[PDB]
Amino acid sequence: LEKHSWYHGPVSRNAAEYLLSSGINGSFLVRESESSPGQRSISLRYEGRVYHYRINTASDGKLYVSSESRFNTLAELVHHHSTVADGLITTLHYPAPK
């Protein structure tokens, strides 16, 4: 859903690291693979470092980063992870510039 400020669409692991390079703790983006669109990941800045998390899909189709917290839509998953880290190194707050 490229309408969201945090959804960057087809961007690479390496480009994500450049896009986050001047961010702070909690700067993040969600990205798609540029070869296989459908593999989506979260890249998240924390203390100078960028962490990458594959967004997994469950049997019933729900999206999750942690088994215990699964959502119908990607916006719901991001919104949840803005209030509880729940598996991530920190909470999601500041979209990387596009």
Added chain:
Amino acid sequence: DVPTKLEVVAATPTSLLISWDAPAVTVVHYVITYGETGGNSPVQEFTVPGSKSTATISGLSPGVDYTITVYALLSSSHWVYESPISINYRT
């Protein structure tokens, strides 16, 4: 030299977004504690980098009065933090 303006920016039923104004001088890091006001229960401790002026707190219990305290560490050579700044918040 103390941090100021500690507040709850926003709250869900179980988590809080807090902020404060940093002292003008270098802060090495912050220690933030939270636990029940007057509660004879374990106060939780966590840390925040000296360049941050916000944090989140999660896994809170509904209907509890929490005391939230920020200690700024202003020195690398001795580990005595500043005077605590405190607020109360009822979930």
